[PDB]
Write a protein that holds these residues in place. Sequence first.
Motif, PDB file in Angstrom:
ATOM      1  N   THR A 181       0.768  -1.235   0.000  1.00 34.34           N
ATOM      2  CA  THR A 181       0.000   0.000   0.000  1.00 34.34           C
ATOM      3  C   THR A 181       0.801   1.289   0.000  1.00 34.34           C
ATOM      4  O   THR A 181       0.726   2.074  -0.947  1.00 34.34           O
ATOM      5  CB  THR A 181      -0.955   0.045   1.232  1.00 34.34           C
ATOM      6  OG1 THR A 181      -0.183  -0.031   2.438  1.00 34.34           O
ATOM      7  CG2 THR A 181      -1.963  -1.121   1.204  1.00 34.34           C
ATOM      8  N   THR A 182       1.522   1.527   1.093  1.00 37.14           N
ATOM      9  CA  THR A 182       2.266   2.769   1.265  1.00 37.14           C
ATOM     10  C   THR A 182       3.701   2.786   0.761  1.00 37.14           C
ATOM     11  O   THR A 182       4.268   3.869   0.545  1.00 37.14           O
ATOM     12  CB  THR A 182       2.261   3.237   2.739  1.00 37.14           C
ATOM     13  OG1 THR A 182       2.725   2.176   3.589  1.00 37.14           O
ATOM     14  CG2 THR A 182       0.863   3.670   3.160  1.00 37.14           C
ATOM     15  N   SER A 183       4.301   1.608   0.610  1.00 38.68           N
ATOM     16  CA  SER A 183       5.680   1.541   0.165  1.00 38.68           C
ATOM     17  C   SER A 183       5.815   0.578  -0.989  1.00 38.68           C
ATOM     18  O   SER A 183       4.860  -0.121  -1.352  1.00 38.68           O
ATOM     19  CB  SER A 183       6.594   1.128   1.325  1.00 38.68           C
ATOM     20  OG  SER A 183       7.210   2.267   1.913  1.00 38.68           O
ATOM     21  N   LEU A 184       7.002   0.562  -1.579  1.00 42.63           N
ATOM     22  CA  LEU A 184       7.289  -0.358  -2.653  1.00 42.63           C
ATOM     23  C   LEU A 184       7.455  -1.714  -1.979  1.00 42.63           C
ATOM     24  O   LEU A 184       7.810  -1.784  -0.793  1.00 42.63           O
ATOM     25  CB  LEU A 184       8.608   0.037  -3.304  1.00 42.63           C
ATOM     26  CG  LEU A 184       8.448   1.137  -4.336  1.00 42.63           C
ATOM     27  CD1 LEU A 184       9.741   1.905  -4.466  1.00 42.63           C
ATOM     28  CD2 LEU A 184       8.000   0.528  -5.661  1.00 42.63           C
ATOM     29  N   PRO A 185       7.198  -2.790  -2.714  1.00 48.41           N
ATOM     30  CA  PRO A 185       7.400  -4.118  -2.147  1.00 48.41           C
ATOM     31  C   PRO A 185       8.913  -4.288  -1.938  1.00 48.41           C
ATOM     32  O   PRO A 185       9.732  -3.503  -2.443  1.00 48.41           O
ATOM     33  CB  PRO A 185       6.901  -5.060  -3.243  1.00 48.41           C
ATOM     34  CG  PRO A 185       6.145  -4.192  -4.195  1.00 48.41           C
ATOM     35  CD  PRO A 185       6.740  -2.846  -4.108  1.00 48.41           C
ATOM     36  N   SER A 186       9.276  -5.284  -1.160  1.00 50.60           N
ATOM     37  CA  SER A 186      10.667  -5.540  -0.873  1.00 50.60           C
ATOM     38  C   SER A 186      11.149  -6.533  -1.933  1.00 50.60           C
ATOM     39  O   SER A 186      10.347  -7.087  -2.699  1.00 50.60           O
ATOM     40  CB  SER A 186      10.736  -6.208   0.472  1.00 50.60           C
ATOM     41  OG  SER A 186      10.164  -7.487   0.306  1.00 50.60           O
ATOM     42  N   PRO A 187      12.449  -6.771  -1.966  1.00 51.32           N
ATOM     43  CA  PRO A 187      13.004  -7.706  -2.917  1.00 51.32           C
ATOM     44  C   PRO A 187      12.430  -9.084  -2.602  1.00 51.32           C
ATOM     45  O   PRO A 187      12.144  -9.868  -3.509  1.00 51.32           O
ATOM     46  CB  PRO A 187      14.478  -7.660  -2.587  1.00 51.32           C
ATOM     47  CG  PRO A 187      14.687  -6.248  -2.191  1.00 51.32           C
ATOM     48  CD  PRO A 187      13.434  -5.763  -1.555  1.00 51.32           C
ATOM     49  N   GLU A 188      12.262  -9.385  -1.319  1.00 51.50           N
ATOM     50  CA  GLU A 188      11.717 -10.677  -0.939  1.00 51.50           C
ATOM     51  C   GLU A 188      10.322 -10.844  -1.524  1.00 51.50           C
ATOM     52  O   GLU A 188      10.015 -11.844  -2.187  1.00 51.50           O
ATOM     53  CB  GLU A 188      11.613 -10.753   0.559  1.00 51.50           C
ATOM     54  CG  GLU A 188      12.879 -11.216   1.208  1.00 51.50           C
ATOM     55  CD  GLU A 188      13.200 -12.679   0.898  1.00 51.50           C
ATOM     56  OE1 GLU A 188      12.240 -13.459   0.666  1.00 51.50           O
ATOM     57  OE2 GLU A 188      14.405 -13.048   0.903  1.00 51.50           O
ATOM     58  N   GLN A 189       9.465  -9.853  -1.286  1.00 53.79           N
ATOM     59  CA  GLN A 189       8.090  -9.913  -1.778  1.00 53.79           C
ATOM     60  C   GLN A 189       8.016 -10.077  -3.265  1.00 53.79           C
ATOM     61  O   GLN A 189       6.981 -10.487  -3.787  1.00 53.79           O
ATOM     62  CB  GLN A 189       7.349  -8.637  -1.423  1.00 53.79           C
ATOM     63  CG  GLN A 189       6.794  -8.618  -0.020  1.00 53.79           C
ATOM     64  CD  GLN A 189       6.415  -7.215   0.395  1.00 53.79           C
ATOM     65  OE1 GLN A 189       6.655  -6.243  -0.347  1.00 53.79           O
ATOM     66  NE2 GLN A 189       5.804  -7.091   1.570  1.00 53.79           N
ATOM     67  N   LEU A 190       9.084  -9.697  -3.964  1.00 50.33           N
ATOM     68  CA  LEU A 190       9.086  -9.719  -5.430  1.00 50.33           C
ATOM     69  C   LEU A 190       9.960 -10.806  -6.015  1.00 50.33           C
ATOM     70  O   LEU A 190      10.223 -10.839  -7.222  1.00 50.33           O
ATOM     71  CB  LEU A 190       9.516  -8.348  -5.946  1.00 50.33           C
ATOM     72  CG  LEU A 190       8.472  -7.274  -5.624  1.00 50.33           C
ATOM     73  CD1 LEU A 190       9.065  -5.869  -5.765  1.00 50.33           C
ATOM     74  CD2 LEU A 190       7.331  -7.463  -6.596  1.00 50.33           C
ATOM     75  N   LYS A 191      10.401 -11.703  -5.153  1.00 51.96           N
ATOM     76  CA  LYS A 191      11.277 -12.798  -5.563  1.00 51.96           C
ATOM     77  C   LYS A 191      10.727 -13.536  -6.758  1.00 51.96           C
ATOM     78  O   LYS A 191       9.523 -13.765  -6.840  1.00 51.96           O
ATOM     79  CB  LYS A 191      11.420 -13.772  -4.408  1.00 51.96           C
ATOM     80  CG  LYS A 191      12.819 -13.937  -3.885  1.00 51.96           C
ATOM     81  CD  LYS A 191      12.920 -15.240  -3.113  1.00 51.96           C
ATOM     82  CE  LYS A 191      13.292 -15.010  -1.664  1.00 51.96           C
ATOM     83  NZ  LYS A 191      12.517 -15.897  -0.749  1.00 51.96           N
ATOM     84  N   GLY A 192      11.587 -13.904  -7.697  1.00 49.51           N
ATOM     85  CA  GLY A 192      11.118 -14.637  -8.873  1.00 49.51           C
ATOM     86  C   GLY A 192      10.265 -13.822  -9.862  1.00 49.51           C
ATOM     87  O   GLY A 192       9.780 -14.366 -10.863  1.00 49.51           O
ATOM     88  N   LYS A 193      10.086 -12.520  -9.614  1.00 51.49           N
ATOM     89  CA  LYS A 193       9.270 -11.723 -10.526  1.00 51.49           C
ATOM     90  C   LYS A 193      10.066 -10.795 -11.388  1.00 51.49           C
ATOM     91  O   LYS A 193      11.146 -10.343 -11.025  1.00 51.49           O
ATOM     92  CB  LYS A 193       8.272 -10.864  -9.765  1.00 51.49           C
ATOM     93  CG  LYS A 193       7.370 -11.626  -8.821  1.00 51.49           C
ATOM     94  CD  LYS A 193       6.464 -12.566  -9.589  1.00 51.49           C
ATOM     95  CE  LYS A 193       5.122 -11.909  -9.946  1.00 51.49           C
ATOM     96  NZ  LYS A 193       4.314 -12.698 -10.947  1.00 51.49           N
ATOM     97  N   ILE A 194       9.480 -10.443 -12.514  1.00 50.78           N
ATOM     98  CA  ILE A 194      10.089  -9.479 -13.395  1.00 50.78           C
ATOM     99  C   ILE A 194       9.100  -8.315 -13.441  1.00 50.78           C
ATOM    100  O   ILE A 194       7.923  -8.520 -13.732  1.00 50.78           O
ATOM    101  CB  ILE A 194      10.175 -10.010 -14.825  1.00 50.78           C
ATOM    102  CG1 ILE A 194      11.329 -10.993 -14.972  1.00 50.78           C
ATOM    103  CG2 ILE A 194      10.345  -8.851 -15.809  1.00 50.78           C
ATOM    104  CD1 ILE A 194      11.512 -11.479 -16.413  1.00 50.78           C
TER     105      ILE A 194
END
Length: 513
Positions: free
Chosen positions: A223-236
């Motif tokens: 919501t308020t911040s960008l996702p973390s690298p963890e939250q975006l793992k495996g994504k492009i």
Amino acid sequence: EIETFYKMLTQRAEIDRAFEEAAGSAETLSVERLVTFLQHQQREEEAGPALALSLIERYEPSETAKAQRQMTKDGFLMYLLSADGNAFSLAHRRVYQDMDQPLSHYLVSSSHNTYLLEDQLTGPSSTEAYIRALCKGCRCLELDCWDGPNQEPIIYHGYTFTSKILFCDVLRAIRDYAFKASPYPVILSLENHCSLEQQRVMARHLRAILGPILLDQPLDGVTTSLPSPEQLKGKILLKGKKLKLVPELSDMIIYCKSVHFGGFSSPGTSGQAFYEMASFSESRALRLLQESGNGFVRHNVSCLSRIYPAGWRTDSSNYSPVEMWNGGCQIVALNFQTPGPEMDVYLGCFQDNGGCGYVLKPAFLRDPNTTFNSRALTQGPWWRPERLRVRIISGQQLPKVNKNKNSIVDPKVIVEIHGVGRDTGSRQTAVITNNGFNPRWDMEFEFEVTVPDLALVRFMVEDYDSSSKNDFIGQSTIPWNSLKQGYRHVHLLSKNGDQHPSATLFVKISIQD
Ligand SMILES: O=P(O)(O)O[C@@H]1[C@H](O)[C@H](O)[C@@H](OP(=O)(O)O)[C@H](OP(=O)(O)O)[C@H]1O
Ligand SMILES: [Ca+2]
Ligand SMILES: [Ca+2]
């Protein structure tokens, strides 16, 4: 001779001395003496029997000594030459940082006009260029999309004579290598010059090719911040202009909406949204750093900024990344295809944290209310002066620096400090003539570093030449906090960042307060 020559050529006094010291009278190192060495000399913090024993178990060649919990001179050398004896912290060579903060809290490995292999005007473009970068851990890739024949978008450097390649071909390559070097998110910076139809083709290919890897929707709660690298793992994820632009594409831009720099400001009224990203040329970034370092810094706390090379760098030369990191800039795009001190330092930084491509920024650069300005240093957390003493003892098997096969290197070593302007420094040893095998310098330099958290130490070896420019033999760049103390071997890399399995420098490092 049979031995004389053999062992004499393969003899290292500096190692003898070090061993003798740690060992004294004895011909071997007892666990106790070893632990002492680890603590006193190597300043290991986990210095203890456990470490000592594992070192012995791992590196002691003598079965006798091994079983008897002792280390011979040979085991001493092996440890010194191993990943544990490496000046670059073995511990930092795996992901160890906090990967749960918003993307804006990490420096991100980024490349500029990734498709290019050479210059910016007439050189070739290739999927290979993407693979190479990705294999070098790059996370943020650049795609310049233009309309192509048969309705298939192509990629190349707009308005130049650079060779072309297909957008789809590029996506497959990315698909295949995106996570070879890291599991953390890849960001595709799309510079879109495609017609509406070809934009549609782009979106199709994206979806079809990337499939599930592709992030096409916000994460829950993000919501308020960008996702973390963890939250975006495996994504492009896609970065580009978001609603001239078809929704098919525009709708895939979730966290990286390309935006024009507005300015910086305290509330949420004028310093873009966390999911908005501005890009600055080297020149412009510099000016802003020059005039509003702190604004940029503060700005970079919760927003990602991308910097790219100045337009005159048509040779694909690179600027120093450090100057941008000193401002908290995270997506500092360099031309990955170009060898130099700049990529050297770049890849040195990114070797950190397991080489995953995301390196957590210093806390003071993650403090929305910092008063830091690398340019106008005042007292604060970032101020933590250290005294670094580096002794360049000797060199081992320096690579034949590209001549032919009859001249012998005349090596000399340069040690540089890269960081905030006030810390930058460079010193060099004398030249040892005609010796690349085991040149011995025994020279010590000392540097004072006020903002170590932003510093990197670089070792460069050159082949001196009165007549011509000194040949670059090898190099190694180590982030300050990954710099190990005591006796260590610096493992030299080639121009291309490749390992030189036997090329090292033996040094003694000490960092004091
Ligand atoms: O390759 P060049 O010749 O140096 O041109 C710039 C470079 O490609 C940047 O990476 C790009 O940044 P962004 O896509 O992040 O904006 C910028 O786009 P732009 O001017 O359309 O912003 C280009 O002008
Ligand atoms: Ca571009
Ligand atoms: Ca020579």
